[PDB]
Amino acid sequence: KDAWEIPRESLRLEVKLGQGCFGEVWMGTWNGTTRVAIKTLKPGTMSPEAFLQEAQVMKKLRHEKLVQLYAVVSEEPIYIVTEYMSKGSLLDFLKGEMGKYLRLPQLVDMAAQIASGMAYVERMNYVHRDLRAANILVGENLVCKVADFGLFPIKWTAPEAALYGRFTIKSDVWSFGILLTELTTKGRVPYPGMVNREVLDQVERGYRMPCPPECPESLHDLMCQCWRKDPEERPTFEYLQAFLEDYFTSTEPQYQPGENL
Ligand SMILES: Cc1ccc(C(=O)Nc2ccc(CN3CCN(C)CC3)c(C(F)(F)F)c2)cc1C#Cc1cnc2cccnn12
Numbered sequence: 001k002d003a004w005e006i007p008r009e010s011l012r013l014e015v016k017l018g019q020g021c022f023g024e025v026w027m028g029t030w031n032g033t034t035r036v037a038i039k040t041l042k043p044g045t046m047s048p049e050a051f052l053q054e055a056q057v058m059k060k061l062r063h064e065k066l067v068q069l070y071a072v073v074s075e076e077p078i079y080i081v082t083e084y085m086s087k088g089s090l091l092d093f094l095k096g097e098m099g100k101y102l103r104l105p106q107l108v109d110m111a112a113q114i115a116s117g118m119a120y121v122e123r124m125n126y127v128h129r130d131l132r133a134a135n136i137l138v139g140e141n142l143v144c145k146v147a148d149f150g151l152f153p154i155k156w157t158a159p160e161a162a163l164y165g166r167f168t169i170k171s172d173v174w175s176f177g178i179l180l181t182e183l184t185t186k187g188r189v190p191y192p193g194m195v196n197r198e199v200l201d202q203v204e205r206g207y208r209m210p211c212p213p214e215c216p217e218s219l220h221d222l223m224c225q226c227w228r229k230d231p232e233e234r235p236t237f238e239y240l241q242a243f244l245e246d247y248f249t250s251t252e253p254q255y256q257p258g259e260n261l
Helices: 048-060 090-095 104-123 159-164 169-184 196-204 217-226 237-245 247-251
Strands: 011-019 024-030 034-040 069-073 079-083 136-138 144-146
Touching: 011 034, 034 069, 048 069, 048 079, 090 136, 090 169, 104 144, 104 169, 104 237, 104 247, 159 169, 159 196, 169 217, 169 237, 217 237, 237 247
Parallel strands: none
Antiparallel strands: 011 024, 024 034, 034 079, 069 079, 136 144
16 A cells, blocks of 8 residues: 555565675566565564564665665565666675776765765764675675675774764764775775774774875875764865865876776
């Protein structure tokens, strides 16, 4: 009883892309013609009402840089159907064969797209809560879109959120600064060689990751703005998006390619 509802026979599940405690992610086909991604809910693993709230949120969000809901099968077994992003998660994309060809212009453009999606989240007064490369999807032509797979990522979380539960758009901005290090290191785990307990105490003392090799200091300066201790002093996503879009003209006009960035 909804315009999003589709018949069960119009959806075909072709390849299992992921497993979870609550369900699976598949690639499949909708209406025989449209390639789609599909989230399933294991019967009895979580409240159907609880699972379907995801779909209710996605019905209200529509932006070119956010993975787009296409369809729902809303009675058990429940299915949530979205557009398909052919290159998979940004984390895997960076770690895999393509990583060797990505240089700073592609990585900054990817960051600018993610910032645009998060600027929409910001305009709509939502909060992501788990922004990191594992929750970004990549398509043809290096298109990047914000997603949420419901995946503790202390290393990506702002200290006021990790310590006190203060999750806001500004703690997402912190996470975006961490995501900038994942881009510029081709997907490495942040704070290399530190465990969670060291990270939280180190960051509280004022430690911040140093500038990654071959990364311009001006982009590390941007990371450090995202990691300001006071959340209201961090930049908006609107600002981050504009900075990254304009980066190679306004900020690094004499960038030259290196071996890795
Ligand atoms: C099937 C599916 C279902 C749902 C979602 C999904 O991301 N839902 C989502 C739910 C909430 C929010 C925002 N809230 C976050 C929390 N926050 C507290 C409130 C706001 C957002 C967001 F994108 F806006 F962030 C997204 C993605 C997929 C996929 C897929 C897929 C597509 N191509 C490929 C290729 C390879 C592997 N997977 N894959």
